[PDB]
Ligand binder design. Structure first.
Ligand code: FE
Ligand code: FE
Ligand code: FE
Ligand code: FE
Lengths: 82, 102, 305, 490, 491, 306, 101, 82
């Protein structure tokens, strides 16, 4: 079910509302954010998209879901590359 | 000249209004206060020549309505740069008119 | 979404049958703080100013479903107000200049300068209360066309205040031994003839409901001031060979009569809602006693030796 | 003869008295007056340094308007609307939409002072302040009204503050916080020392300078005339500030001024910044936004505050870095979300404009440049779906403006989040979070437009439901690229 | 309450009385008054159709000036002087120099009527007329004055009427003849029906249309405001004329208006015709000079004269041919002798302009074009001594302007001469000779500037000596090609 | 040949003033070109009738000065400031008219005042129109524009007073329709003995065509006599008769009159720079004064008349 | 360092909007403050006129340089902004700072 | 000896002052007029330049002098081609 996050994509100029699902993996999250960023204001590039709590050091496991991750609805996340 | 004779034999009367906030309200007033006459307008940017055949009335009441603020007939000379026709002005209206038909 | 043509005027005005006037264009429907009942201002719905307005504007027992349809019967805008008042005020200023040239003030009846010090020059406190009160009705009125009449009325009260200031000083120059310019605050605070007026105004300034504030200011306080202060002062001046004051006050009465005109028009707009008639008359019955005592005490003091 | 003003002026302001039939605190309640407990007698030394009196005021204001309206009438055929750059016309639309009904609101802040200030000279000068703002509201509705017949976007001179469009909500959040939503003494020092002696000079004199270069004298002449009023009624602030310092309230005064300046800066960065560096045609850029900022806000305004006795704000260095970066990203967001604007944002990134931007902001092309390249490529390839968004930006719970940062080569972006009373808020800066913490009861149950979005208040829950909610009444009203992407040809 | 103007207006003009201690003829001498023997009583039915009264006059004229000056002050940094085409700048220079102190002289015309008209309503309207012309003189000195510091040619706004420059003499001959040099009733019908309802509309409203196209709103706004006064005080003519006609003087009124219109025509052909068809840049030409003439002079003004009871002038066909031809040669005369002007004439003959000229004036290239071909080839080939003259043009003894005709393929030129009291006079038209003959004493001992050159009054008797005589104080003052010949490059 | 010179900051004739030229300097000074050529004032035949008239009545006047153009209006009025000032005074007078009519002022005057007014006041429109005509004459003859300009404004002032008098005559007629008000002024001006000194003075004043003598008789003899023997005694009579409007009206008209006297005095002072003018001015003043005195005596005696 | 130098200034004086008061105010500033350098920055729409520490404009000098009768209050028709604190009376306006930075 | 005439040259647009000499032949007068017209506003041409009284039919003889012609000073002449 719907899970709103605020997401900042690496190299974009802003944070956007992106509504993901409760059982989305981090991979699936990264891709739902990419949709609104890459090839719109951000060059495509090679590498693996990772999701983290905003500004934090530790990346979430790619295969971890939103539910398992402990994020709250409307929290802020960064989508960044390895 | 055919051209000259044609230019001279006109019966066009009405105000020449200088560029400013009285142009559109005088045009509109001319149409409203002369029902049934065709009003012609030549726009030269710095002024507008407004005319009808034989006679053209501007009443103070309509001009006030179209202008959108209180207005006295006397104030018209702030913007009336010229006119065709003879003039008969009073507290309620001004009339541009010809005695002759050419 | 559909495609639509340009309008000749504001969207809110395009249903008008006549061409909108300067007044319509610059004055109508400008309070946006009436759009959302929960949140007058763009803040927490519970911020102190939002609670102030929900209580003292929105919950007023004086109601109408379209306060914004009110129209100043004079249709004044800032520009035409200044044109008009620059005419009246430079007329009054010219009177001051010429009556000073004629030394009018030396020629008043013996003792007049004492009646002025006691009955005229403290008016500056009364007129400043009207100024304060007018500003309150302005900030609380539920339509900009109402608020606009209050702004102009606020300026007019300061005009009157400034008249009084100027003439108190001017009189003191001819009569330096009467407390002119020195004792007005004491008089306002302690002289009995001023105490009914000051009590009335202090309470009036603490009626915070907008309809109550409007009714008490414009329908009770201000007509009382016209009939019990302005006109009797003109009569008295006439009896004491003061020919300046009656002319000054006639100019102030033009303002006061304009304030009555837009007031009465607001009353008539309000009385469209049949409930409003008991609301207004109740506020009138409530304040009139206060106002009558104010007049009575003023007039005994004006009457006496 | 007439007697000179200095001889009778004191009497015009001898109007405090000791109330008896009600208490002092009933007459001047603290939540409307803001006297901070300073008793009546102390407010009588208030001395406005820019005086006027009623006969002078009406005489001089009559002449000011005579000139402003005669210049408008004399130029009605200059063809500005026709011969002007479309980005210039958008400047006008956004100015009048953002400002006109805000001026009319400002009447209520002057009215607050006129009734509830305990300083008699304040109450009189605020009465002229009331009159002034009425002027400013009526002018700035009268002047655009003639363009209603050319373009529906000019309806917004009147309509913006009546809508829930996002930039209007931002204007209203600021003005309702600083002007109409506070007590008299807060208005006295927050309105006068953030907008009136500060950022109003950017929008009304910096922009006049650009309008003069663009050949728009009607506009230049109108807004420089407006600011002559402001220069007078804004001088109600210094004596209020001086009394608060003399009576032990320096800290409280400092905090109120610090907060108002920051809130003003965030609004004027989205309103004026894009205008001066992108909408205004290159040849008409008298100075950059940053250069004007250094002139008016650092050189003149902040220096005046120090002279009055305040310190540099605590956020000084954050503020100077904001100057170099914020409005570039605000521009990009207004532009990329231009359907949600009531004006037609100009992208302002041709090669020659990208060079000017690189000279006024070294490193521009490595930052915002990187986003503009993606967008440019998509326009040349005709992927127009890719230059229209499908989601909403995340918005600051204080300024009501999109959360942004520096994009591209040294990507850097920070949201300042805050938990409070069971709710999570997000802010665009440290200062904006600090402002919230100074006065939670002012802000805590406010919901920004995205809060409303997520809570089911905007149906349907899509960009298009959002546009109905924001109050657009036709397709023509929604913002488009000002040159219909003609810049892409260059 | 206030009582409305119509109920007290009659008393403002109940001011005629029967004199006793001097005679009526002493009080109103015919040389100053021009009553033509018509008795006072008859003058009392004079009824000005465009009324004003003192309180309204000062209020309304206060507002007219507030606007004129505020528009000026607000545009004082629009770069007009700096970005304007130099042909537009020249138009300003020649307008101010030819008009400003002529307006101030017009005060004396209105003062002549104010004192010596037997019509009481004329005497009051002429009093506002005095005030109006004072306004016009002060505005048209104030506005060019700020350009002094940029260009000494702008000094001629003040200096021109104080000089013997030949165009200024043409200006003063006309204005002294029609305005300051005749009796009150002559002023009433010659000034109001030649300049004020006639050629003034060309110079102050026609030129305003060009000014607005060129973006000079300070100027356009000023001269259209001026003309609002004139539309009022020029209405003193019609009732005077009507009285002349009702009292048997139609023939002498016809003669006067006929003469004044021709005199005005020749002067404004030299001032206005070159401005509209040559100096004003081509994109800013609202209409051609001749189109403007047909709008203002034939369509409006002459039509109004007929409505008031006059006939077409007897020279109607000559006039219409003159409208097609004369200003093209006056332009050529002014430009070739540009060094004698206080402005810089624009040649106005790039191919683009010549196409426009050909279209507005079919046959133009086989006429004036022949002359401009030769001029242009000399500029292109750097033979500059051949684009400056080495003698004087012969000059009309009425209009003070050079004698000209149609050049090129159907060359036609004619001088109308006259021996009179031992002197030979030359005139540029049948009409100008006829004017002279209507009132020899007005003109006979006048010497035009070429007459003066030949009688020893210009020392030394050279072109440079003439230039000093004409009042030039420095090299920068004398005219040159407006674009320094850069137009050659487009040919 | 020709020098090079740079652009001046003002008109060539003003460019050596020590001070920055004022609005008044720029627009008022040195504008009569008709004084440049003593044989041909106007650009016509030297012997045209107007050239003969100006050679005789201006150029050959006994009153002489080699720089009349240095004369300066001490009020330094231009058209623009005149209108500003008079719109102020006149809208003040018009506001008095309105208010005093609201208070039915004219009903409260002392019995019979309307008859004095019809006799002594309302025919002032003829007198004032004479000063109007006579001012226009000085304007057109005077040898400097700065002089002529003070006369233009004085001409307008005369018409202002004339219009006041018209407006009041009519307004008063509405309260007293049986006094001849607005009906019999022409007959009084022509037949009433109180008016005959004035009318004879004006008729002969209006036929003095020398500019110098026109100026001296109008402004140094006739007009100060109207202030002293007509305006102030009328104020004095209205006071005795409970007319409070007229002293106010006349006080505004007197401001105009004092301004006429100030520029007049300043012009005498300029003319006295040449010592021969002392005799010429006193000659003219002695010549005209008995006529003025007589006019006043006859008027005052009519006004008193019970 | 740019910001420090922008902030650390002592410039005071009028900001005059485009119109007929610009040159007379400049001239009045030069004359009424002898021994001060008057700087002038012209932005077309307005002109920024300043001196260090104190800048005086008297009514008399202003009226002389303007060329027409002039009361000090009228200055607000054209005084669009100002640097420094202000003190204004019938005879002059004074722009000044209490502190030296 | 100085002899002032007003001359109109064929195809030119004005009449000019040209000072000739009492003893000039008409060929010389003609040359003195041309100096101020041909190559200034008038194209050169082949042909013989002649002199006549203004608007007159009859030409003066090429050799006739000013003296002999009867012209008074300041009369108008045309210089035309035959
Ligand atoms: Fe404002
Ligand atoms: Fe403000
Ligand atoms: Fe004129
Ligand atoms: Fe005229």
């Amino acid at each position: 079910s719907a899970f709103p996050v605020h997401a900042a994509f690496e190299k974009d100029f802003l944070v956007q509302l992106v509504v993901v699902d409760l059982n989305d993996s981090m991979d699936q999250v990264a891709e739902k954010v990419a949709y609104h960023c890459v090839n719109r204001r951000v060059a495509p590039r090679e590498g693996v998209m990772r999701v983290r709590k905003h500004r934090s050091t530790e990346l979430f496991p790619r295969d971890m879901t939103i539910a398992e991750s402990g994020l709250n609805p409307t929290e802020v996340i960064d989508v960044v590359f390895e | 000249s055919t051209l000259a004779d044609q230019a001279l034999h006109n019966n066009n009367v009405g105000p020449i209004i200088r560029a400013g906030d009285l142009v559109e309200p005088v045009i509109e007033t001319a149409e409203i206060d002369n029902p049934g006459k065709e009003i012609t307008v030549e726009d030269r940017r710095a002024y507008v020549r407004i005319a009808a055949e034989g006679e053209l009335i501007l009443t103070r009441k309509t001009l006030e309505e179209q202008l959108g603020r209180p207005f006295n007939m006397q104030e018209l000379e702030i913007n009336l740069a010229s006119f065709a026709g003879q003039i008969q002005a009073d507290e309620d209206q001004i009339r541009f008119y010809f005695d002759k038909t050419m | 979404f559909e495609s639509k043509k340009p309008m000749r005027t504001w969207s809110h005005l395009a249903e008008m049958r006549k061409k909108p006037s300067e007044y319509d264009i610059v004055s109508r429907k400008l309070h946006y703080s009436t759009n959302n009942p929960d949140s007058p201002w763009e803040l927490s719905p519970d911020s102190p100013m939002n609670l102030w307005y929900k209580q003292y504007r929105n919950a007023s027992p004086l109601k109408h479903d379209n306060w914004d349809a009110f129209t100043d019967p004079d249709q004044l805008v800032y520009r035409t107000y200044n044109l008009m008042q620059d005419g009246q005020e430079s007329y009054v200023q010219s009177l001051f200049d010429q009556f000073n040239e004629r030394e009018h003030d030396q020629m008043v009846r013996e003792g007049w300068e004492h009646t002025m010090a006691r009955c005229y020059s403290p008016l500056r406190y009364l007129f400043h209360c009207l100024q304060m009160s007018s500003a309150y009705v302005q900030q609380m009125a539920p339509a900009s066309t109402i608020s606009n009449c209050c702004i102009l009325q606020t300026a007019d009260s300061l005009r009157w205040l400034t008249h009084t200031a100027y003439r108190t000083h001017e009189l003191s120059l001819t009569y330096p031994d009467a407390g002119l310019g020195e004792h007005e605050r004491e008089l306002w605070e302690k002289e009995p003839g001023w105490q009914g007026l000051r009590e009335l105004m202090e309470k009036q300034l603490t009626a915070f409901d907008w309809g109550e504030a409007f009714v008490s200011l414009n329908l009770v306080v201000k007509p009382m001031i016209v009939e019990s202060i302005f006109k009797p002062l003109q009569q008295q001046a006439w009896e004491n060979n003061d020919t300046l004051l009656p002319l000054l006050i006639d100019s102030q009465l033009k303002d006061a009569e304009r304030h009555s005109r837009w007031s009465k028009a607001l009353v008539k707009h309000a009385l469209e809602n049949p409930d409003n008639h008991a609301v207004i008359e109740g506020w009138i019955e409530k304040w009139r006693p206060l106002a009558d005592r104010a007049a009575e005490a003023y007039l005994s003091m004006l009457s006496s030796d | 003869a007439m007697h000179p003003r200095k001889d009778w002026y004191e009497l015009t302001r001898a109007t405090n008295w000791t109330p008896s039939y009600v208490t002092e605190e009933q007459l001047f309640p603290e939540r409307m007056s803001g006297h901070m407990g300073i008793p009546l007698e102390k407010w009588e030394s208030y001395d406005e340094p820019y005086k006027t009196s009623y006969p002078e005021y009406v005489s001089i204001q009559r002449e000011k308007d005579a000139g402003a309206y005669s210049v408008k009438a004399a130029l009605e055929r200059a063809k500005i609307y026709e011969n002007s750059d479309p980005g210039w016309i958008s400047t006008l639309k956004s100015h009048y939409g953002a400002i006109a009904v805000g001026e009319y609101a400002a009447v209520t802040g002057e009215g607050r002072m006129a009734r509830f200030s305990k300083a008699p000279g304040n109450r009189n000068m605020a009465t002229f302040g009331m009159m002034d703002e009425l002027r400013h509201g009526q002018l700035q509705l009268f002047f655009p009204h003639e363009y209603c017949k050319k373009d529906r976007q000019f309806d917004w001179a009147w309509r913006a503050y009546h809508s829930n469009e996002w930039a209007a909500i931002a204007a209203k959040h600021f003005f309702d916080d600083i002007i109409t939503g506070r007590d008299a003494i807060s208005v006295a020092i927050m309105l006068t020392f953030s907008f009136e002696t500060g950022f109003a000079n950017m929008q009304f004199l910096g922009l006049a300078a650009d309008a003069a270069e663009a050949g728009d004298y009607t506009f230049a002449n109108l807004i420089s005339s407006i600011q002559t009023d402001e220069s007078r009624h804004a001088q109600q602030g210094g004596p209020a500030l001086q009394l608060l310092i003399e009576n032990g309230k320096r800290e409280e005064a400092q905090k109120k001024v610090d907060m108002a300046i920051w809130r003003a800066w965030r609004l004027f960065a989205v309103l004026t910044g894009p205008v001066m560096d992108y909408y205004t045609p290159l040849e008409d850029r008298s100075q950059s936004f940053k250069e004007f900022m250094y002139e008016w806000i650092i050189g003149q305004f902040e220096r005046s505050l120090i002279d009055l006795g305040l310190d540099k704000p605590w956020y000084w260095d954050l503020f100077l870095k904001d100057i170099d970066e914020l409005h570039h990203s605000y521009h990009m967001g207004v532009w990329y979300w231009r359907t949600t604007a009531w004006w037609n944002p100009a992208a302002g990134v041709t090669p020659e404009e990208r060079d000017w931007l690189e000279e006024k902001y070294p490193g521009w092309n490595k930052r915002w440049g990187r986003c503009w390249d993606v967008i440019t490529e998509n326009v040349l390839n005709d992927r127009m779906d890719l230059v229209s968004p499908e989601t909403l930006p995340s918005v600051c719970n204080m300024s009501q403006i999109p959360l942004v940062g520096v994009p591209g080569d040294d990507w850097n972006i920070e949201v300042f989040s805050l938990e409070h009373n069971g709710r999570l808020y997000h802010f665009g800066s440290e200062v904006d979070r600090w402002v919230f913490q100074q006065d939670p009861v002012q802000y805590q149950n406010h919901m920004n437009i995205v809060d409303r979005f997520l809570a089911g208040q905007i149906q349907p829950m899509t960009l298009e439901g959002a546009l109905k909610y924001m109050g657009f009444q036709s397709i023509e009203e929604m913002g488009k690229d000002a040159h219909d992407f003609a810049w892409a040809d260059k």
